[PDB]
Amino acid sequence: ALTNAQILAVIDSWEETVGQFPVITHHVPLGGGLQGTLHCYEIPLAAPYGVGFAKNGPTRWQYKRTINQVVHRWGSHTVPFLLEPDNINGKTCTASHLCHNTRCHNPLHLCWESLDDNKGRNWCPGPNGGCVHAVVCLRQGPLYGPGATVAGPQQRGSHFVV
Amino acid sequence: ALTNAQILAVIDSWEETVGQFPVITHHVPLGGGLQGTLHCYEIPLAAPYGVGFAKNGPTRWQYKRTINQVVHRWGSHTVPFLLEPDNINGKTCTASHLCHNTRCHNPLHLCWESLDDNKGRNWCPGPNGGCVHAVVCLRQGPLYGPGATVAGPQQRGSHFVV
DNA sequence: TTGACTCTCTTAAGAGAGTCA
DNA sequence: TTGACTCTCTTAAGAGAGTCA
Ligand SMILES: [Mg+2]
Ligand SMILES: [Mg+2]
Ligand SMILES: [Zn+2]
Ligand SMILES: [Zn+2]
Ligand SMILES: [Zn+2]
Ligand SMILES: [Zn+2]
Protein backbone atom coordinates (compact mmCIF):
# COMPACT_ATOMS: atom_id res chain seq x y z
CA ALA A 1 0.00 0.00 0.00
CA LEU A 2 0.86 3.65 -0.13
CA THR A 3 3.19 4.13 2.93
CA ASN A 4 6.85 2.95 3.00
CA ALA A 5 5.99 1.39 6.39
CA GLN A 6 3.02 -0.46 4.83
CA ILE A 7 5.24 -1.65 1.95
CA LEU A 8 7.94 -2.88 4.38
CA ALA A 9 5.26 -4.76 6.33
CA VAL A 10 4.07 -6.42 3.09
CA ILE A 11 7.65 -7.47 2.25
CA ASP A 12 8.21 -8.81 5.80
CA SER A 13 4.95 -10.87 5.82
CA TRP A 14 5.81 -12.28 2.37
CA GLU A 15 9.32 -13.25 3.47
CA GLU A 16 7.98 -14.95 6.61
CA THR A 17 5.44 -16.99 4.62
CA VAL A 18 7.82 -17.89 1.75
CA GLY A 19 10.41 -18.75 4.43
CA GLN A 20 8.18 -21.69 5.45
CA PHE A 21 7.91 -23.06 1.89
CA PRO A 22 9.76 -26.37 1.45
CA VAL A 23 13.48 -25.89 0.77
CA ILE A 24 14.54 -28.02 -2.19
CA THR A 25 18.20 -28.46 -3.05
CA HIS A 26 19.09 -28.23 -6.74
CA HIS A 27 22.55 -29.01 -8.11
CA VAL A 28 23.24 -26.83 -11.13
CA PRO A 29 25.81 -26.26 -13.87
CA LEU A 30 27.88 -23.13 -13.30
CA GLY A 31 29.78 -23.16 -16.58
CA GLY A 32 33.43 -24.11 -16.95
CA GLY A 33 32.64 -27.74 -16.11
CA LEU A 34 31.82 -26.77 -12.52
CA GLN A 35 28.68 -27.49 -10.46
CA GLY A 36 27.05 -25.61 -7.58
CA THR A 37 24.13 -25.96 -5.16
CA LEU A 38 21.05 -23.75 -4.88
CA HIS A 39 18.36 -23.91 -2.18
CA CYS A 40 14.98 -23.01 -3.69
CA TYR A 41 11.96 -22.17 -1.52
CA GLU A 42 9.21 -23.74 -3.62
CA ILE A 43 5.53 -22.80 -3.50
CA PRO A 44 3.33 -25.93 -3.21
CA LEU A 45 1.93 -27.59 -6.34
CA ALA A 46 -1.68 -27.28 -5.15
CA ALA A 47 -3.77 -25.36 -2.68
CA PRO A 48 -3.19 -24.36 0.04
CA TYR A 49 -0.06 -22.42 -0.98
CA GLY A 50 0.47 -20.21 2.07
CA VAL A 51 -1.13 -17.20 3.72
CA GLY A 52 -1.84 -14.55 1.10
CA PHE A 53 -0.99 -16.69 -1.95
CA ALA A 54 -3.23 -17.92 -4.77
CA LYS A 55 -2.58 -19.44 -8.19
CA ASN A 56 -3.73 -17.44 -11.22
CA GLY A 57 -2.06 -19.63 -13.85
CA PRO A 58 -0.30 -22.99 -14.31
CA THR A 59 2.94 -21.38 -13.09
CA ARG A 60 1.63 -17.93 -12.05
CA TRP A 61 0.76 -16.84 -8.48
CA GLN A 62 -0.32 -13.63 -6.74
CA TYR A 63 0.18 -12.28 -3.21
CA LYS A 64 -2.79 -10.51 -1.59
CA ARG A 65 -3.10 -8.38 1.57
CA THR A 66 -5.92 -6.26 3.03
CA ILE A 67 -4.62 -2.80 4.11
CA ASN A 68 -6.99 -0.03 5.29
CA GLN A 69 -9.96 -2.30 4.37
CA VAL A 70 -8.68 -2.41 0.73
CA VAL A 71 -7.28 -5.51 -0.99
CA HIS A 72 -3.84 -4.94 -2.56
CA ARG A 73 -2.52 -7.65 -4.92
CA TRP A 74 0.82 -8.23 -6.66
CA GLY A 75 2.49 -10.82 -8.82
CA SER A 76 3.92 -13.28 -6.31
CA HIS A 77 7.58 -12.71 -7.29
CA THR A 78 7.33 -8.89 -7.47
CA VAL A 79 6.96 -8.29 -3.72
CA PRO A 80 10.70 -8.04 -2.81
CA PHE A 81 11.01 -5.11 -5.24
CA LEU A 82 8.02 -2.95 -4.23
CA LEU A 83 10.35 -0.09 -3.22
CA GLU A 84 12.25 -0.15 -6.52
CA PRO A 85 11.52 1.77 -9.73
CA ASP A 86 9.00 -0.21 -11.77
CA ASN A 87 10.62 0.65 -15.09
CA ILE A 88 14.06 1.14 -16.59
CA ASN A 89 14.86 2.99 -19.80
CA GLY A 90 11.13 2.97 -20.55
CA LYS A 91 10.91 -0.82 -20.17
CA THR A 92 8.85 -2.55 -17.51
CA CYS A 93 10.81 -4.15 -14.68
CA THR A 94 10.14 -7.86 -14.16
CA ALA A 95 10.96 -10.43 -11.52
CA SER A 96 13.73 -12.59 -13.01
CA HIS A 97 14.55 -16.09 -11.69
CA LEU A 98 18.31 -16.55 -11.36
CA CYS A 99 17.58 -20.20 -10.49
CA HIS A 100 15.33 -20.69 -13.56
CA ASN A 101 12.78 -22.38 -11.19
CA THR A 102 9.33 -20.73 -11.48
CA ARG A 103 7.91 -22.25 -8.26
CA CYS A 104 10.84 -20.82 -6.31
CA HIS A 105 10.16 -17.67 -4.32
CA ASN A 106 13.58 -17.33 -2.62
CA PRO A 107 14.37 -13.60 -2.96
CA LEU A 108 18.06 -14.51 -2.98
CA HIS A 109 17.27 -16.13 -6.34
CA LEU A 110 15.39 -13.14 -7.86
CA CYS A 111 16.38 -9.90 -9.52
CA TRP A 112 14.43 -7.00 -11.00
CA GLU A 113 15.22 -6.19 -14.62
CA SER A 114 13.80 -5.72 -18.10
CA LEU A 115 12.07 -8.66 -19.77
CA ASP A 116 14.92 -8.72 -22.32
CA ASP A 117 17.58 -9.02 -19.55
CA ASN A 118 15.40 -11.66 -17.86
CA LYS A 119 15.00 -13.79 -21.00
CA GLY A 120 18.67 -13.52 -21.95
CA ARG A 121 19.80 -15.29 -18.80
CA ASN A 122 18.39 -18.53 -20.32
CA TRP A 123 21.43 -18.64 -22.64
CA CYS A 124 24.12 -17.30 -20.31
CA PRO A 125 27.25 -19.50 -20.00
CA GLY A 126 27.12 -18.98 -16.22
CA PRO A 127 29.23 -17.54 -13.40
CA ASN A 128 32.13 -19.94 -14.11
CA GLY A 129 31.78 -19.93 -17.90
CA GLY A 130 31.92 -16.23 -18.76
CA CYS A 131 28.77 -14.53 -17.45
CA VAL A 132 29.05 -10.76 -17.92
CA HIS A 133 25.76 -9.84 -16.21
CA ALA A 134 26.45 -6.99 -13.78
CA VAL A 135 24.06 -8.72 -11.39
CA VAL A 136 25.74 -12.08 -11.78
CA CYS A 137 23.99 -15.30 -12.76
CA LEU A 138 23.71 -18.09 -10.19
CA ARG A 139 23.94 -20.82 -12.84
CA GLN A 140 24.50 -21.49 -16.51
CA GLY A 141 21.28 -20.86 -18.45
CA PRO A 142 19.30 -24.04 -19.25
CA LEU A 143 19.36 -23.24 -23.00
CA TYR A 144 23.08 -22.51 -23.31
CA GLY A 145 24.82 -24.68 -25.88
CA PRO A 146 25.46 -25.32 -29.57
CA GLY A 147 21.78 -25.47 -30.53
CA ALA A 148 20.11 -27.86 -32.99
CA THR A 149 20.05 -25.87 -36.23
CA VAL A 150 18.49 -27.82 -39.10
CA ALA A 151 19.85 -25.72 -41.98
CA GLY A 152 22.40 -22.94 -42.16
CA PRO A 153 22.75 -19.96 -44.49
CA GLN A 154 22.68 -20.96 -48.14
CA GLN A 155 21.88 -19.80 -51.70
CA ARG A 156 21.17 -21.70 -54.95
CA GLY A 157 22.45 -18.93 -57.26
CA SER A 158 25.06 -16.17 -57.16
CA HIS A 159 23.04 -13.09 -56.18
CA PHE A 160 24.11 -12.74 -52.52
CA VAL A 161 27.20 -12.02 -50.44
CA VAL A 162 27.60 -12.16 -46.66
CA ALA B 1 1.51 -31.35 -53.93
CA LEU B 2 4.32 -29.25 -55.43
CA THR B 3 7.19 -31.36 -56.79
CA ASN B 4 10.72 -30.77 -55.47
CA ALA B 5 11.43 -29.20 -58.92
CA GLN B 6 8.46 -26.82 -58.49
CA ILE B 7 9.80 -25.93 -55.01
CA LEU B 8 13.29 -25.22 -56.40
CA ALA B 9 11.66 -22.94 -58.99
CA VAL B 10 9.91 -21.01 -56.14
CA ILE B 11 13.27 -20.67 -54.32
CA ASP B 12 14.93 -19.45 -57.54
CA SER B 13 12.18 -16.86 -58.22
CA TRP B 14 12.42 -15.72 -54.62
CA GLU B 15 16.21 -15.37 -54.83
CA GLU B 16 15.94 -13.45 -58.12
CA THR B 17 13.50 -10.95 -56.59
CA VAL B 18 15.26 -10.57 -53.22
CA GLY B 19 18.61 -10.11 -54.98
CA GLN B 20 17.25 -6.87 -56.44
CA PHE B 21 16.33 -5.45 -53.01
CA PRO B 22 18.46 -2.48 -51.87
CA VAL B 23 21.75 -3.81 -50.47
CA ILE B 24 22.79 -1.96 -47.32
CA THR B 25 26.28 -2.21 -45.82
CA HIS B 26 26.24 -2.41 -42.00
CA HIS B 27 29.27 -2.37 -39.69
CA VAL B 28 28.65 -4.74 -36.77
CA PRO B 29 30.30 -5.98 -33.58
CA LEU B 30 31.78 -9.47 -33.90
CA GLY B 31 32.80 -9.88 -30.26
CA GLY B 32 36.30 -9.59 -28.83
CA GLY B 33 36.23 -5.84 -29.62
CA LEU B 34 36.41 -6.59 -33.38
CA GLN B 35 34.18 -5.03 -36.04
CA GLY B 36 32.93 -6.61 -39.24
CA THR B 37 30.68 -5.91 -42.19
CA LEU B 38 27.32 -7.42 -43.20
CA HIS B 39 25.45 -6.76 -46.45
CA CYS B 40 21.69 -6.90 -45.91
CA TYR B 41 19.16 -7.14 -48.74
CA GLU B 42 16.34 -5.07 -47.27
CA ILE B 43 12.66 -5.30 -48.23
CA PRO B 44 11.20 -1.80 -48.80
CA LEU B 45 9.40 0.03 -45.99
CA ALA B 46 6.17 0.36 -48.02
CA ALA B 47 4.45 -1.09 -51.06
CA PRO B 48 5.50 -2.13 -53.64
CA TYR B 49 7.92 -4.59 -52.02
CA GLY B 50 8.80 -6.79 -55.00
CA VAL B 51 7.13 -9.39 -57.19
CA GLY B 52 5.32 -11.93 -55.02
CA PHE B 53 5.75 -10.03 -51.71
CA ALA B 54 3.13 -8.49 -49.43
CA LYS B 55 3.14 -7.21 -45.85
CA ASN B 56 0.95 -9.02 -43.31
CA GLY B 57 2.30 -7.18 -40.25
CA PRO B 58 4.46 -4.23 -39.17
CA THR B 59 7.55 -6.40 -39.66
CA ARG B 60 5.97 -9.51 -41.21
CA TRP B 61 5.81 -10.38 -44.92
CA GLN B 62 4.66 -13.28 -47.09
CA TYR B 63 5.72 -14.64 -50.48
CA LYS B 64 2.97 -15.89 -52.82
CA ARG B 65 3.12 -17.88 -56.07
CA THR B 66 0.24 -19.39 -58.06
CA ILE B 67 1.07 -22.78 -59.58
CA ASN B 68 -1.36 -24.75 -61.75
CA GLN B 69 -4.18 -22.46 -60.60
CA VAL B 70 -3.48 -23.05 -56.87
CA VAL B 71 -2.29 -20.16 -54.69
CA HIS B 72 0.64 -21.06 -52.42
CA ARG B 73 1.89 -18.73 -49.69
CA TRP B 74 4.84 -18.83 -47.29
CA GLY B 75 6.37 -16.62 -44.64
CA SER B 76 8.77 -14.40 -46.54
CA HIS B 77 11.92 -15.66 -44.75
CA THR B 78 10.93 -19.36 -44.84
CA VAL B 79 11.39 -19.80 -48.61
CA PRO B 80 15.14 -20.72 -48.56
CA PHE B 81 14.28 -23.69 -46.33
CA LEU B 82 11.34 -25.27 -48.20
CA LEU B 83 13.41 -28.42 -48.95
CA GLU B 84 14.49 -28.84 -45.30
CA PRO B 85 12.81 -30.62 -42.38
CA ASP B 86 10.32 -28.29 -40.72
CA ASN B 87 10.74 -29.48 -37.11
CA ILE B 88 13.49 -30.81 -34.85
CA ASN B 89 13.33 -32.32 -31.34
CA GLY B 90 9.57 -31.83 -31.45
CA LYS B 91 9.96 -28.07 -32.06
CA THR B 92 8.87 -26.08 -35.12
CA CYS B 93 11.68 -24.69 -37.25
CA THR B 94 11.76 -20.90 -37.66
CA ALA B 95 13.71 -18.53 -39.88
CA SER B 96 16.41 -17.00 -37.69
CA HIS B 97 18.18 -13.74 -38.64
CA LEU B 98 21.92 -14.04 -38.12
CA CYS B 99 22.09 -10.31 -38.92
CA HIS B 100 19.29 -9.42 -36.46
CA ASN B 101 17.79 -7.18 -39.18
CA THR B 102 14.15 -8.16 -39.70
CA ARG B 103 13.73 -6.44 -43.09
CA CYS B 104 16.74 -8.33 -44.45
CA HIS B 105 15.93 -11.29 -46.72
CA ASN B 106 19.53 -12.23 -47.60
CA PRO B 107 19.49 -16.06 -47.36
CA LEU B 108 23.18 -15.96 -46.37
CA HIS B 109 21.94 -14.16 -43.23
CA LEU B 110 19.27 -16.75 -42.29
CA CYS B 111 19.23 -20.11 -40.60
CA TRP B 112 16.48 -22.60 -39.78
CA GLU B 113 16.13 -23.61 -36.13
CA SER B 114 13.84 -23.76 -33.10
CA LEU B 115 12.38 -20.53 -31.76
CA ASP B 116 14.46 -20.97 -28.58
CA ASP B 117 17.73 -21.27 -30.60
CA ASN B 118 16.60 -18.28 -32.69
CA LYS B 119 15.89 -16.07 -29.66
CA GLY B 120 19.09 -17.08 -27.90
CA ARG B 121 21.26 -15.56 -30.61
CA ASN B 122 20.19 -12.09 -29.34
CA TRP B 123 22.58 -12.53 -26.38
CA CYS B 124 25.45 -14.38 -28.08
CA PRO B 125 28.94 -12.86 -27.58
CA GLY B 126 29.58 -13.40 -31.30
CA PRO B 127 31.93 -15.29 -33.62
CA ASN B 128 35.01 -13.53 -32.19
CA GLY B 129 33.77 -13.38 -28.59
CA GLY B 130 32.99 -17.00 -27.73
CA CYS B 131 30.02 -18.13 -29.83
CA VAL B 132 29.37 -21.86 -29.40
CA HIS B 133 26.49 -22.11 -31.89
CA ALA B 134 27.22 -25.03 -34.20
CA VAL B 135 25.89 -22.91 -37.05
CA VAL B 136 28.05 -19.95 -36.10
CA CYS B 137 26.72 -16.45 -35.48
CA LEU B 138 27.63 -13.74 -37.97
CA ARG B 139 27.78 -11.06 -35.26
CA GLN B 140 27.52 -10.39 -31.56
CA GLY B 141 23.89 -10.38 -30.47
CA PRO B 142 22.38 -6.90 -30.04
CA LEU B 143 21.43 -7.60 -26.40
CA TYR B 144 24.77 -9.07 -25.28
CA GLY B 145 26.33 -7.27 -22.35
CA PRO B 146 26.15 -6.54 -18.63
CA GLY B 147 22.45 -5.66 -18.73
CA ALA B 148 20.63 -2.96 -16.79
CA THR B 149 19.40 -4.76 -13.70
CA VAL B 150 17.61 -2.37 -11.34
CA ALA B 151 17.78 -4.50 -8.18
CA GLY B 152 19.63 -7.69 -7.32
CA PRO B 153 18.86 -10.55 -4.95
CA GLN B 154 18.18 -9.36 -1.42
CA GLN B 155 16.27 -10.09 1.77
CA ARG B 156 15.20 -7.93 4.69
CA GLY B 157 15.39 -10.65 7.36
CA SER B 158 17.33 -13.89 7.77
CA HIS B 159 14.77 -16.42 6.52
CA PHE B 160 16.75 -17.40 3.42
CA VAL B 161 20.05 -18.86 2.29
CA VAL B 162 21.18 -19.01 -1.33
C1' DT C 1 -2.59 -14.59 -61.12
C1' DT C 2 -1.32 -10.66 -58.66
C1' DG C 3 -1.01 -6.67 -55.21
C1' DA C 4 -2.22 -4.46 -51.04
C1' DC C 5 -4.36 -4.59 -47.59
C1' DT C 6 -7.15 -7.13 -43.54
C1' DC C 7 -7.37 -10.48 -39.40
C1' DT C 8 -5.68 -13.75 -35.69
C1' DC C 9 -2.07 -17.15 -33.83
C1' DT C 10 2.76 -19.29 -31.33
C1' DT C 11 6.24 -19.40 -27.71
C1' DA C 12 8.13 -18.90 -23.13
C1' DA C 13 9.95 -15.49 -20.20
C1' DG C 14 6.74 -12.41 -17.72
C1' DA C 15 1.77 -9.58 -15.97
C1' DG C 16 -3.33 -7.53 -14.32
C1' DA C 17 -8.10 -8.33 -12.82
C1' DG C 18 -12.98 -10.74 -11.69
C1' DT C 19 -16.05 -14.53 -9.48
C1' DC C 20 -17.52 -16.94 -5.88
C1' DA C 21 -17.57 -19.02 -0.92
C1' DT D 1 -10.80 -11.15 5.53
C1' DT D 2 -8.94 -14.94 3.43
C1' DG D 3 -8.93 -18.73 0.07
C1' DA D 4 -9.49 -20.95 -4.45
C1' DC D 5 -10.57 -20.59 -8.45
C1' DT D 6 -11.69 -18.06 -13.36
C1' DC D 7 -10.31 -14.99 -17.39
C1' DT D 8 -7.24 -12.16 -20.54
C1' DC D 9 -2.84 -9.30 -21.34
C1' DT D 10 2.70 -8.08 -22.59
C1' DT D 11 6.90 -8.70 -25.16
C1' DA D 12 9.78 -9.69 -29.13
C1' DA D 13 11.60 -13.44 -31.61
C1' DG D 14 8.50 -15.83 -34.89
C1' DA D 15 3.66 -17.71 -37.94
C1' DG D 16 -1.13 -18.94 -41.12
C1' DA D 17 -5.14 -17.36 -43.60
C1' DG D 18 -9.23 -14.03 -45.86
C1' DT D 19 -11.09 -10.24 -49.04
C1' DC D 20 -11.39 -7.59 -53.14
C1' DA D 21 -10.51 -6.10 -57.70
MG1 LIG E 1 13.75 -15.69 -16.28
MG1 LIG F 1 16.17 -13.95 -34.37
ZN1 LIG G 1 15.37 -20.82 -6.59
ZN1 LIG H 1 24.88 -14.30 -16.75
ZN1 LIG I 1 20.98 -9.22 -43.15
ZN1 LIG J 1 26.38 -17.56 -31.44
Side-chain angles (χ1 to χ4, degrees), chain B residues 38-41 97 99 101 104-106 109:
Chain B
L38 295 179
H39 303 96
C40 292
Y41 291 65
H97 276 87
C99 60
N101 176 7
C104 178
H105 285 67
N106 186 347
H109 289 183

PDB file of all heavy atoms in Angstrom, chain B residues 38-41 97 99 101 104-106 109, ligand 5:
ATOM      1  N   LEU B  38      28.383  -6.585 -42.659  1.00  0.00           N
ATOM      2  CA  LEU B  38      27.323  -7.420 -43.201  1.00  0.00           C
ATOM      3  C   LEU B  38      26.607  -6.651 -44.305  1.00  0.00           C
ATOM      4  O   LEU B  38      26.509  -5.423 -44.263  1.00  0.00           O
ATOM      5  CB  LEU B  38      26.336  -7.847 -42.104  1.00  0.00           C
ATOM      6  CG  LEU B  38      26.943  -8.751 -41.020  1.00  0.00           C
ATOM      7  CD1 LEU B  38      25.872  -9.095 -39.978  1.00  0.00           C
ATOM      8  CD2 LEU B  38      27.538 -10.011 -41.627  1.00  0.00           C
ATOM      9  N   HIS B  39      26.140  -7.371 -45.318  1.00  0.00           N
ATOM     10  CA  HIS B  39      25.454  -6.761 -46.452  1.00  0.00           C
ATOM     11  C   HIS B  39      24.028  -7.295 -46.498  1.00  0.00           C
ATOM     12  O   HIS B  39      23.796  -8.419 -46.960  1.00  0.00           O
ATOM     13  CB  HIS B  39      26.223  -7.045 -47.732  1.00  0.00           C
ATOM     14  CG  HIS B  39      27.642  -6.579 -47.674  1.00  0.00           C
ATOM     15  ND1 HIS B  39      28.688  -7.410 -47.340  1.00  0.00           N
ATOM     16  CD2 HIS B  39      28.185  -5.358 -47.898  1.00  0.00           C
ATOM     17  CE1 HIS B  39      29.820  -6.723 -47.365  1.00  0.00           C
ATOM     18  NE2 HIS B  39      29.542  -5.476 -47.700  1.00  0.00           N
ATOM     19  N   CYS B  40      23.088  -6.482 -46.026  1.00  0.00           N
ATOM     20  CA  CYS B  40      21.693  -6.899 -45.911  1.00  0.00           C
ATOM     21  C   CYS B  40      20.884  -6.485 -47.133  1.00  0.00           C
ATOM     22  O   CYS B  40      21.006  -5.360 -47.630  1.00  0.00           O
ATOM     23  CB  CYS B  40      21.068  -6.322 -44.640  1.00  0.00           C
ATOM     24  SG  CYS B  40      21.752  -7.036 -43.112  1.00  0.00           S
ATOM     25  N   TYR B  41      20.019  -7.382 -47.582  1.00  0.00           N
ATOM     26  CA  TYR B  41      19.157  -7.136 -48.741  1.00  0.00           C
ATOM     27  C   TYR B  41      17.764  -6.821 -48.196  1.00  0.00           C
ATOM     28  O   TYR B  41      17.012  -7.725 -47.824  1.00  0.00           O
ATOM     29  CB  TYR B  41      19.164  -8.336 -49.692  1.00  0.00           C
ATOM     30  CG  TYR B  41      20.476  -8.549 -50.420  1.00  0.00           C
ATOM     31  CD1 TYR B  41      21.638  -8.877 -49.714  1.00  0.00           C
ATOM     32  CD2 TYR B  41      20.554  -8.431 -51.803  1.00  0.00           C
ATOM     33  CE1 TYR B  41      22.847  -9.064 -50.356  1.00  0.00           C
ATOM     34  CE2 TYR B  41      21.760  -8.622 -52.457  1.00  0.00           C
ATOM     35  CZ  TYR B  41      22.901  -8.942 -51.724  1.00  0.00           C
ATOM     36  OH  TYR B  41      24.117  -9.126 -52.360  1.00  0.00           O
ATOM     37  N   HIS B  97      17.308 -14.757 -38.036  1.00  0.00           N
ATOM     38  CA  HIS B  97      18.180 -13.738 -38.640  1.00  0.00           C
ATOM     39  C   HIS B  97      19.537 -13.705 -37.945  1.00  0.00           C
ATOM     40  O   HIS B  97      19.661 -13.185 -36.821  1.00  0.00           O
ATOM     41  CB  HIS B  97      17.556 -12.352 -38.554  1.00  0.00           C
ATOM     42  CG  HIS B  97      16.590 -12.045 -39.654  1.00  0.00           C
ATOM     43  ND1 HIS B  97      15.257 -12.384 -39.590  1.00  0.00           N
ATOM     44  CD2 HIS B  97      16.761 -11.410 -40.838  1.00  0.00           C
ATOM     45  CE1 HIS B  97      14.646 -11.973 -40.686  1.00  0.00           C
ATOM     46  NE2 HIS B  97      15.535 -11.376 -41.460  1.00  0.00           N
ATOM     47  N   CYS B  99      21.785 -11.736 -38.934  1.00  0.00           N
ATOM     48  CA  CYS B  99      22.091 -10.309 -38.920  1.00  0.00           C
ATOM     49  C   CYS B  99      21.189  -9.501 -37.995  1.00  0.00           C
ATOM     50  O   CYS B  99      21.393  -8.293 -37.852  1.00  0.00           O
ATOM     51  CB  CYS B  99      22.006  -9.752 -40.341  1.00  0.00           C
ATOM     52  SG  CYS B  99      20.349  -9.966 -41.066  1.00  0.00           S
ATOM     53  N   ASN B 101      18.336  -8.290 -38.399  1.00  0.00           N
ATOM     54  CA  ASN B 101      17.790  -7.179 -39.179  1.00  0.00           C
ATOM     55  C   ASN B 101      16.539  -7.717 -39.875  1.00  0.00           C
ATOM     56  O   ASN B 101      16.641  -8.363 -40.918  1.00  0.00           O
ATOM     57  CB  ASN B 101      18.837  -6.674 -40.176  1.00  0.00           C
ATOM     58  CG  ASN B 101      18.314  -5.583 -41.105  1.00  0.00           C
ATOM     59  OD1 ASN B 101      17.198  -5.080 -40.941  1.00  0.00           O
ATOM     60  ND2 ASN B 101      19.135  -5.204 -42.088  1.00  0.00           N
ATOM     61  N   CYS B 104      15.804  -7.647 -43.576  1.00  0.00           N
ATOM     62  CA  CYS B 104      16.740  -8.333 -44.451  1.00  0.00           C
ATOM     63  C   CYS B 104      16.183  -9.686 -44.878  1.00  0.00           C
ATOM     64  O   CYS B 104      15.645 -10.437 -44.062  1.00  0.00           O
ATOM     65  CB  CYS B 104      18.075  -8.517 -43.735  1.00  0.00           C
ATOM     66  SG  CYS B 104      19.304  -9.407 -44.724  1.00  0.00           S
ATOM     67  N   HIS B 105      16.308  -9.990 -46.174  1.00  0.00           N
ATOM     68  CA  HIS B 105      15.926 -11.289 -46.719  1.00  0.00           C
ATOM     69  C   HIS B 105      17.106 -11.996 -47.378  1.00  0.00           C
ATOM     70  O   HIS B 105      16.915 -12.948 -48.134  1.00  0.00           O
ATOM     71  CB  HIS B 105      14.768 -11.132 -47.712  1.00  0.00           C
ATOM     72  CG  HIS B 105      13.446 -10.891 -47.049  1.00  0.00           C
ATOM     73  ND1 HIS B 105      13.172  -9.738 -46.343  1.00  0.00           N
ATOM     74  CD2 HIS B 105      12.329 -11.655 -46.973  1.00  0.00           C
ATOM     75  CE1 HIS B 105      11.945  -9.806 -45.850  1.00  0.00           C
ATOM     76  NE2 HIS B 105      11.410 -10.957 -46.225  1.00  0.00           N
ATOM     77  N   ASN B 106      18.336 -11.540 -47.108  1.00  0.00           N
ATOM     78  CA  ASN B 106      19.530 -12.225 -47.599  1.00  0.00           C
ATOM     79  C   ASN B 106      19.562 -13.650 -47.055  1.00  0.00           C
ATOM     80  O   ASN B 106      19.695 -13.830 -45.835  1.00  0.00           O
ATOM     81  CB  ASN B 106      20.766 -11.442 -47.149  1.00  0.00           C
ATOM     82  CG  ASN B 106      22.066 -11.985 -47.717  1.00  0.00           C
ATOM     83  OD1 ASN B 106      22.120 -13.086 -48.270  1.00  0.00           O
ATOM     84  ND2 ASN B 106      23.151 -11.220 -47.519  1.00  0.00           N
ATOM     85  N   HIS B 109      22.103 -14.682 -44.583  1.00  0.00           N
ATOM     86  CA  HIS B 109      21.940 -14.155 -43.230  1.00  0.00           C
ATOM     87  C   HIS B 109      20.864 -14.896 -42.437  1.00  0.00           C
ATOM     88  O   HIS B 109      20.466 -14.418 -41.364  1.00  0.00           O
ATOM     89  CB  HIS B 109      21.586 -12.665 -43.268  1.00  0.00           C
ATOM     90  CG  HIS B 109      22.707 -11.770 -43.703  1.00  0.00           C
ATOM     91  ND1 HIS B 109      22.584 -10.395 -43.732  1.00  0.00           N
ATOM     92  CD2 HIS B 109      23.969 -12.047 -44.120  1.00  0.00           C
ATOM     93  CE1 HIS B 109      23.720  -9.865 -44.160  1.00  0.00           C
ATOM     94  NE2 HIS B 109      24.573 -10.843 -44.403  1.00  0.00           N
TER      95      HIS B 109
HETATM   96 ZN    ZN E   5      20.982  -9.217 -43.150  1.00  0.00          ZN
END
